[PDB]
Structure formats: structure tokens, C-alpha cells
Amino acid sequence: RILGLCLLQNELCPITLNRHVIKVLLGRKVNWHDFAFFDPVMYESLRQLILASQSSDADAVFSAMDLAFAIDLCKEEGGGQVELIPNGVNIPVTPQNVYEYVRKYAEHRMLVVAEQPLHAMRKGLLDVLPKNSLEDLTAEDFRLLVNGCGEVNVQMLISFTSFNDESGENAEKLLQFKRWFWSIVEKMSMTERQDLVYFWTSSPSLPASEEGFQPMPSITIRPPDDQHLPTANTCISRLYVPLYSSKQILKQKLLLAIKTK
Amino acid sequence: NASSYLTSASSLARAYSIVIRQISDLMGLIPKYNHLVYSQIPAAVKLTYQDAVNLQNYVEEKLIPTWNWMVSIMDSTEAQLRYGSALASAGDPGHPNHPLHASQNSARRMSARGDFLNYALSLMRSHNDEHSDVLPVLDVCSLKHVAYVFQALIYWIKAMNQQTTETGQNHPFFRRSDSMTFLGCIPPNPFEVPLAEAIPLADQPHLLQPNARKEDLFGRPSQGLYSSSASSGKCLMEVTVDRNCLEVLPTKMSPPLTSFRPQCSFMGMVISHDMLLGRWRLSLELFGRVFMEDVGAEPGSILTELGGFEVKESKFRREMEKLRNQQSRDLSLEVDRDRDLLIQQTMRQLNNHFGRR
Amino acid sequence: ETAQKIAKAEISSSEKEEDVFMGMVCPSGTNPDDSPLYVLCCNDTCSFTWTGAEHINQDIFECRTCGLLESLCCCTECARVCHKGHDCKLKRTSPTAYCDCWEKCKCKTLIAGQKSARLDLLYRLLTATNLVTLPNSRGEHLLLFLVQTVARQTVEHCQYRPPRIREDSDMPDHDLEPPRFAQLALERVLQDWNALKSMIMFGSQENKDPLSASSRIGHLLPEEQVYLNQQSGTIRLDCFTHCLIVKCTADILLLDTLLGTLVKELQNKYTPGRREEAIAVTMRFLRSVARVFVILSVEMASSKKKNNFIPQPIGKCKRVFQALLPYAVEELCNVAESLIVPVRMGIARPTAPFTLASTSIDAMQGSEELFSVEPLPPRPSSMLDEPLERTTNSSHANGAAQAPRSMQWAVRNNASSYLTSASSLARAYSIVIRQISDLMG
Amino acid sequence: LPYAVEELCNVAESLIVPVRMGIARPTAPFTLASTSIDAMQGSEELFSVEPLPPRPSS
Ligand SMILES: [Zn+2]
Ligand SMILES: [Zn+2]
Ligand SMILES: [Zn+2]
């Protein structure tokens, strides 16, 4: 419901679920290729298995240690022993019928263990939004809306960022200051940029497009002041920064400010 | 205050699109013409099956020349875009001439004589299929008339074709859904190619972008063209850049009323909109990404229906605005920065407020 | 000759005369620049051997490996022999100067060989093996490199001043004529149909060059492979015909000899299979010649002053067309329909208006900026003038910047009107039609 | 319908001939209306005209 509210409120609430999770959230049809988004290692294992299935020597591989319809469940599933196929304990896995089992294996984790959670999530989502508005979307649109940009990037910040100055002492100095600020911000890695935007607009995930930001970004470059930290407000997400002729001191102080939560 | 040939041509093309759409919509009434027109409007003209089929071959025989013109133009531009993509994925970004070079954007940031000589040389080379290693000189933004006529003909095809209307190894669970399927092309085999090429989006969770092509998002599909198991003019692959040879190609290509059963055969072969779209996939996506302020408003446009991410998000945002303007209650939340009390207050308030049998 | 004598006596047990001669005259795996004939054609003499010491115009290469920089400059002759493999490069700004690699490195070009023996060796190596079909390290055939050397030498050797009759002893000897080898070499190499076929057909489905993105396509998908396979290569061919028609204005016998050789090759009857090959060679050559003629006729202006009635480049093109009339007219018709189809199909790409040169000197520009370009190199392995802005609601005109980057090469956003581009294309078509009519008459 | 489709096809070909022949007379850009009143307008000037009157007397 909070995800759907963030959708309705045109806000980005970063909860980046797996592809199949949101695909079944929408009430679409799950498929096998989503296993690639699920766990690439196990997807590659199943792909190699299905490739060997075509080869006539696969049963010879089955003669190595006598594979069967039994797998070692991880501690995530809760332990214990769950039979994959009824009356399949004695029956070994055969290449002539592995494909079906392979499909089962997918739903053995995509759906068998994850029926109630995804079902409840979709049911809750359906009770806050209409069915008609739900369609025309997919996993990619939902991901670009909820998570916003997959990471926090400086170029999309430049896409929606307006600078104004109430002093106008020098345009060249203003340009040099903003160039230095953007240059130092660009060198920031993932998490620090996340915190920087968490102080910029209180959300590390930038809006997907120009639309998505309910207020218009605005940063006022005030005349220089020796002791004045930049101020930020989330009502319009506006910033006020002094014309810091000294660079690194301002950089470090804003870094420690955005470090604080 | 401009008087530009292109906008006059575009307006003529829009008129043509509207009249062609009206023709197609009228023809959609043929199967139920004995219940939609001949029984509702007190003034109606009787129609006969043989006259109907004669009329249909008449409309085909009248639309053939502009259809051939559109096929030639779209085939040439799609071939040039495909060659551009192939050379971009096969050329050094270092050289100034490469496609994926910041100097070839021509929109974010040279002489007129140079430009015209480049266009003349590009045409001279493209005619005799001699266009290797140097990009074509084409302005896909200067074909808005082609865009409108292509849209009109595609609408006609889709209307009439819709009016007409597997297990084990190819199990239903091992087949892509609408999320990843590409119309007009055989989906790539989910087994031979690995994850790094078949589904590149799984490998890198950061390939998503507001400007993200579905191709690199979900790999390159394949199409059954060229002379291999094909003996048709349309089935011959589009690997030919020019428009003179691509003009002699399609030129040399040559009972109750409720069962009218349109055929759309047109160019001697059964035409399905999926394969036709697959032929011009690059140009279709480029048209959807360049021309959208004008061709988008046209009802039932192929670009709007097959629009990129921006169309989807804009439509959903407009729907959000529409659905948000009739409620009477806000969130009215009251939470705290902690963890445990935050969750407890969230669950208690959301259950108490929005909870009832 | 000793190698021929040795190779004539060999056991053919998985061996051949050619497989035992190529591997001993230019062994396999060798770098292209070590190919004997390219070394033969790039030997010449250093500029200092005729420029004296004072600044006389000549191109300027810097040899960073051997230290020559910042008023220490090595010429183009020494950039292939003395500095073969250094981090040499070309300076965009080229003030007049003179070569000084002799005093800073070992200029192995100080003295020349024997000219008659040089011509004889060129003869023998051309008639002997197929080393002429391989490009040098820059992906250009021997003929194209030879023609570019001829074009440069024609404009640079007029500066030679005879030693008119009217302290320093360590200076290199500087009393010999500039190299005359390029002209003779081109004249002798234009008469070997193997070389001519290689040059004109360069860029075909079979022939490929390392300095071309079409060489390595194996790793690409089949669709990209076929799309890149269909298109033949013509950048090198256009370069060759441009340099032979427009640039080397000093001499006219070069194209006369070329046309003589092509005429000898088209009429052959005894040798089988030569008709189709010579027809294809002449067709591609005439297509490229038509391209050059069309461009350098479009750029020029039909000025009534001085009643010149014919310029030199279009004059060479006219002589070529007259020499090969039956096929020249067919190729010209093909080029004409090429030029005119977009005019009548309603797709004339917009182009801004432009002026026209009053003389051929300005006409040579643009043509030089376009023809003298090199193909896109392959993709290896798998003060700031442009500032950035942060603005919103910047929507003036626009409509072409929202497309994905991979295609934005083909989409554009002081008139640039459809009609003037259509008119210019129509004028080109009219020029082609007028030439067709004058030939047919 | 049977004759309406024929006449519409003829009209469409009439309009499209310059587009596929490249002979169109240039025209300046304009903004489409959004109301039926402006749909009636403009059309009023286009349609409601009288022919060229004859030259009187000789
Ligand atoms: Zn030198
Ligand atoms: Zn050196
Ligand atoms: Zn030297």
C-alpha cells in the first residue's frame, strides 16, 4: 500500500523487489526467463542441465552419482525435507522427463515457497488501485517508477536542477563554483550520492523524468559567508548555499552533514 | 511566417491518414452491414457479395502505387538504420565518424556545401550498394509525411486483419510473455545463448535508463529473411540501402454479407501486421521516439500503441492525476523516526483506518 | 633472380613454386610495411637533399620517440623510412620549416640508390608475385599510396630551385633533385592488370583491409554480418579516382595510361573469362569517376566570364568518359537515376543554401574535405569549448533530441529548406544529363 | 457505402499525388483548433464564396 501510495503521490519510495515479484504483483503470468533475474547461478545450472538433456550422454552423467528427484534445500526455505514429485523418491531423474521437473524447480522457489506472500501483495495492491490503470505497465516501467534511476547519477540531477543567485557579484565566479561543485559531486560513489540526494530532496532515487518532481528544483547561491552551512527545505526541495570561495571546507562540511541522518 | 514544404507535405499526409482511416472504418462495417447500416439508418444502399469483392479488389488496385512508394521509402530508411546500428556495434568509438560518438549527436551540441556534397555522395554510393564503413546521410526527422502515410496503411492493415479474426520442448512456461516478446521476429532460443547475451538485463541491474532500448535490454532477436527457405520479394532481406533498387523490388514483386471475410492480400501475399512491423522495427521505434507530438494524437497510431517508456509513464501519471481528484481524505500520517514504534504505529493506524469486512 | 633459380628446383611434396617463393621473398606473418614493394615505393630521398637548409614548404611530422619536437621536425619522406615505427605524428598547424632528423637520429634517407635498378626491381616484383594486392599498414593499396605521393610531390617539387651560379661542412649534401620515382612507378604499375584489378576492386566481398570495419566481422551476429557484407568498399576507390583526377594536375598521361590499360583489358578474346572481370572493373571505375565528376561539377559555377567553357577536373572526367563511351554512358545513367530518385519520391533531405566557387581553387575544397577521408577503424577488443547547463522547460522548436542515442546519428534538430536541397540535386541531375547528351552526340 | 468508398479513394489519391510525387506548393504552419466553433470558422471563409463574376457588356 505504501508502494501504491508513492505511485499515486508521484513520489519515489525505493523498494526494489525482484522481477518476478512485481510481475506477479500486477497479476501477469510468471515465466521461466524470470529465473535469470532470480539467481543467475542457478539459472545457469538449469540451462546447462537442459543443454545436457539434449545430449545422449546425459544419462551417463546420471550414472556418476545416481541423481534423483531429491535436492538439498537451503536454510532459507526453513529446512526439513519436502518431496519434489510424489512417488519420485525411488524414481530417479531421467532426461526423458527432466524438462517438466526443471519447470517445477523454477516454481519450486518462484511460487511453491512464495505463494502466500506474493498473493497477499497483489491482493493488497488491487484494493488501492483500479485494474485498468494497472495494465499498460510491466516490470521495467514499475522499476523505473519505484526505484527511479537504478542508481543515483549526477547527469539526471543536472536534468532537473535550477540555479539562481540573489547577489550577482560575478557570473564567472558563479560558474566556476558550480563547476567545482558538480565535479566533486561526480566523484562521489553510490552510497554517498544516495545520502547527498537524501539531503537534497530527501530521497536518494531521482525522478524518472522531468515530471515526477512535484516541486521545481531550485538552488540559491548567496554571497559568501565564512560560517553558514547550506540550508535545505523539502516543501519545495529548495537549497541555499553560500558562495564558498574555499572549496574543500564546504565539500567536507556538506559531506559530514549528509552523513548525519 | 515559415512556409516550409515539409509542413505542407505533413498536413497533406494527415488529411490522407484521416481519409484512409475513414475508408478502413467503413470497410469494417461490411461484415455487419446488414445490421449496422441497412437496419439502423432508414436510408441505406443494398450491397451484394460479388460487388463487395469487386469493390475490395478495386480499393487494393487503387492503393497499390502509394503503398509501393511507402514500402520503398520505409525499406530504404530501415535498411540505413540497420546498417548504422551494425556499424556502431562494429566500429571504433575513437574515430570522429563513429555513430556512438558525442560529435554525431547533432542535437545536444558542418558547412552547408559540405552537407550537400555529403548527401549527394551518400546517394551515389547507396544506389549501387557500395555503402560500407561510412555512415549514410539521412535525416529520419524529415519524413513526417512518410510517417503519417505509414501509420494510415498500418491502421488499414490491422483493421482488416483483425476483422478476419506446442508443449514439451516448447513448453508454455519456457516462452517469453508480452514483457519480452518481439512481434514479427522469432523469439531467441532460451537455451543455446547464455544469460550475458540472451537477457543482458539480468546480468547488469543498472542497464535500466529513461532512455533504454528494448533491444539491448533483452538481447537481439532473429528474423527469417534472405533466400534461405524463402522465394518471395518481401521475404528477401532488406540488406540494400538505396531507394532506386528498392523501388524496382516491390514493383517487380507484382454468399451472405455476414461472411465478407476480407483478405488484405494486397501484394500477392497474405499480410499480417506483425511481420510488417518486424520489417521496420528500427524505423518504427525511431519514429515513435522522434515524432510523437503530432503523430501521437492520431487515434490508433502504431507508434503510440508501441510507444517507449516515456509514453507509458506519461499515461500512468495522467491516470494518477485523474484518479486523485475525487478523493476526500489525505494520508494524515503521524509517525516517528524510530524503528519499532514506527512499524507498530504504521500497522495499527493503517489497520484501524482502512479496515472493515 | 637467384631466388627464382633456387625455387625452380623443388620437390612438390606439399610444396609449390609460389608457396616456396612468397615465403622466402615476403614470408607469411610479416608486418605489411616490410613488404618489399612498399619499401621500394616509399624509399625516395629526404627533403633536405634538395631544400638546402632554409624553410621551404613541406609537411611536418614530429617523431616523439627520437625526440624531434618544438622546432625539430621530420618530413614525410623520413616518416616512412627513418622513423618507421616511432611515435610519429602529424601537426595540424604546419608552419614552413625543413627536415632535421639527420642531426637528431640516423636519417637513412640521406643518399639514394640506383634509379634504373629500382625500376627494374619494381618491374620484376610486380610481374613475379602477388605482393601488390596486399595493403600496407595504413590499409591503403600500393596504387593509392603511390597516387597520394604523386599528388603531394606535384605541388611540392615546383619549389625546387636550380643551383644558379653567382664555414659550414657538417651539413648533409643538398644538391640533388627531388624524387622522380613516384610518377614513373605509377606509370609502370598502371599497366599490370593484376594491380589495376586489385586497386579498382579494392573493398569487394573478398578483398578486405585492416583499416576497415568490414575486415573483422566474425564475432558479430549474422544479421550485422550480412548487412556489412552486402555493401562493397568504395572509400579507397573514391580516394584513388579523386587523387588521379582532381589532385595530380601536373600530368595528364597518368589517366591516359590507365584508360589505355583498361581498353586493352576489355577487348580481350583469346584469354577466357577476362570479359566479365574487365567489365566489372570498368563499371566500378566509371562509377567512381562519375561520383568525382558530379561533385566537382556541382561545386563549380557556370560562370560566363573569360569563356573558359571547361575546367581541368571536369576536363579529365570528360576525357575518361569519351574514352570508354559505351560503358561510360550506362554508368552515367545509373548515377543519374541515383541522384534523381529522392527528388521525385518526395524525400529530398533538407540542406542549407550555399554559394558557388568562381574558380576551381575554391571548388577543390569541400571535395578535398570529403573524398580525402578514411574509413571507420575497427573496434578494438570487444580550455573547454563545450560547457554544461542545468535548465528546465527549455523547449524551443526541438523535437529531435528525445530519440535513443544509438540512432541519434541519423536525426537532426541559415534556411535549411527542402526546396533548395531538391534544386541542388536537380542541378546535379541536369549536369549528368547534359554530359550524357554531349557524349551521345 | 459502395460508391462512398470509391469516391473517398479517388479523393485520397488526389490529395496524396503531390506527396508521393514531390511537387507540393509550400504552406506556412498553423495550429489546429480544439472547438467546433473554430471548425465552422475558417471553413466558412473557404466554402462560402461566390464565383468570378462575368465581364459585363463586352
Ligand atoms: Zn627528411
Ligand atoms: Zn625517429
Ligand atoms: Zn631522415
| Close Cβ partners of B111 (under 8 Å, ≥ 6 residues apart) | C354, C366
Q: A65 vs chain B: nearest CA distance in angstroms?
A: 25
CA B257 – CA B255 distance, rounded (Å): 7
Chain D residues inside the 8 Å CB shell of C344: 21-22
Whether A74 sits among the annotated catalytic residues: the reply is no
CA B51 – CA C326 distance, rounded (Å): 54
Contact of C291 with C339, CB cutoff 8 Å:
no
The secondary structure element, H or E, covering residue B43 is none
Residue B328, all three cell numbers: 476526500
Q: Determine D/A contact with 3+ CB pairs under 8 A as the test.
A: no
Burial class, A20, CB count within 10 angstroms (exposed 0-12 / middle 13-18 / buried 19+): buried
> Nearest Cα to B83, choosing from C214, C59, C192?
C214
Residue A241, all three cell numbers: 548555499
Q: Select from B168, B350, B354 the Cβ nearest to the Cβ of A99.
A: B168
CB–CB contact A28 B177 (8 Å): yes
| Close Cβ partners of C234 (under 8 Å, ≥ 6 residues apart) | B125, B130, B131, B132, C203, C284, C288
Beta-carbon-side half-sphere exposure of residue C324 (alpha carbons within 13 Å): 32
> Nearest Cα to B273, choosing from B139, B173, B159, B145?
B159
- What one-character DSSP code corresponds to residue A137? -
Chain length of chain D: 58
Q: Which residue has the cell 480544439?
A: D34
Angle among Cα B49, B50, B53 to the nearest 5 degrees reads 85
Residue B4, all three cell numbers: 516550409
CA C196 – CA C191 distance, rounded (Å): 8
Beta-strand ranges (E) seen in chain A are 163-164, 218-222, 231-233, 238-242
Chains interfacing with C (3 or more CB pairs < 8 Å): A, B, D
Contact of C406 with B88, CB cutoff 8 Å:
yes
The secondary structure element, H or E, covering residue B217 is helix B214-217
The 3 state secondary structure assigned to chain C is CHHHHHHCCCCCCCCCHHHHHHHHHCCCCCCHHHCHHHHHHCCCCCCHHHHCCCCCCCCCEEECCCCECCCCCECCCCCCCCCCCCCEEECCCCCCCCCCHHHHCCCCCCCCCCHHHHHHHHHHHHHHCCHHHCCCCCCCCHHHHHHHHHHHHHHHHHHCCCCCCCCCCCCCCCCCCCCCHHHHHHHHHCCCHHHHHHHHCCCCCCCCCCCCCCCCCCCCCHHHHHHHHHCCCCHHHHHHHHHHHHHCCCCCHHHHHHHHHHHHHHCCCCCCCHHHHHHHHHHHHHHHHHHHHHHHHHHECCCCHHHCCCCHHHHHHHHHHHHCHHHHHHHHHHHHHHHHHHHHHCCCCCECCCCCECCHHHHHHHHHHHHCCCCCCCCCCCCCCCCCCCCCCCCCCCCCCCCCHHHHHHCCCCCCEHHHHHHHHHHHHHHHHHHHHHHHC
Q: Which residue has the cell 523454477?
A: A106
**How far is the first Cα of chain A from the last one, in angstroms, to the nearest whole number?**
25
Burial B118-148 (b: 16+ CB within 10 A, else e): bbbbbbbbbbbebbbbbbbbbbbbbbbbbbb
Chain D CB within 8 Å of residue B29 CB = yes
CA D53 – CA C39 distance, rounded (Å): 88
Burial C194-209 (b: 16+ CB within 10 A, else e): ebbbbbbbbbeeebbb
Return the amino acid letter for C146. L
Chain C CB within 8 Å of residue D5 CB = no
Contact of A210 with A159, CB cutoff 8 Å:
yes
- What one-character DSSP code corresponds to residue A240? E
Resolution (A): 3.5
CA D17 – CA D24 distance, rounded (Å): 9
Q: How many CB pairs under 8 A join A and B?
A: 104
| Number of Cβ within a 10 Å radius of residue A248 | 10
Burial C228-250 (b: 16+ CB within 10 A, else e): bebbbbbbbbbbbbbbbbbbbee
Q: How was this model experimentally determined?
A: cryo-EM
Chain D CB within 8 Å of residue B23 CB = yes
3-class secondary-structure state, position B265 = coil
Q: Which residue has the cell 515524432?
A: B291
Chain D CB within 8 Å of residue B59 CB = yes
